[PDB]
Design a protein around this ligand. Sequence first.
Ligand SMILES: O=C(CSCCc1ccccc1)C(F)(F)F
Length: 185
Amino acid sequence: SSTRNELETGSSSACPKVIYIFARASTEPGNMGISAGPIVADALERIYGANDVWVQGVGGPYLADLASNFLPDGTSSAAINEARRLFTLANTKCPNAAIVSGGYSQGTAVMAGSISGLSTTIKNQIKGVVLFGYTKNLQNLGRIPNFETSKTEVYCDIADAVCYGFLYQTDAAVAAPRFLQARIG
Ligand SMILES: O=C(CSCCc1ccccc1)C(F)(F)F
């Protein structure tokens, strides 16, 4: 459940309802990690059908190392390009799937940096984005640059220091799936 590649591996003859793309926290294993990621993946699969959700982690060159949190974008440029690559693949393979996405900690910076740079038509296919412990919360004014704020939800705990420039279990299991579901329609 730490590694999910249903989008890379998916065929455009079998497009699902939902494509879910997740960027993990620093240090987490796989491309999904072991906290926020799998929890949102399971909630979505419960709502829509395991067969009607493609779950996809941002792996490849997104190494999730701590040092990269200090780069100007809060992550590496290769992690950002890999998330872009993946959203782009979702749109080429399945232009009608609802794309939803999530990030936890540094993955939050992968989500904000990739989405802010994508085309109008790709961003339109992204129906919802959930950010858990958003490391660029203050810098980005609680939103993703160039992406509609009604589609964005930030879970930023009062005691979460990264939010001022595992605390999110009920956010991930309960509040995030509902937010996403309200917009997948
Ligand atoms: O991916 C995240 C990166 S933010 C961690 C960097 C940091 C945390 C607390 C205090 C100083 C620096 C995390 F590692 F999951 F938290």
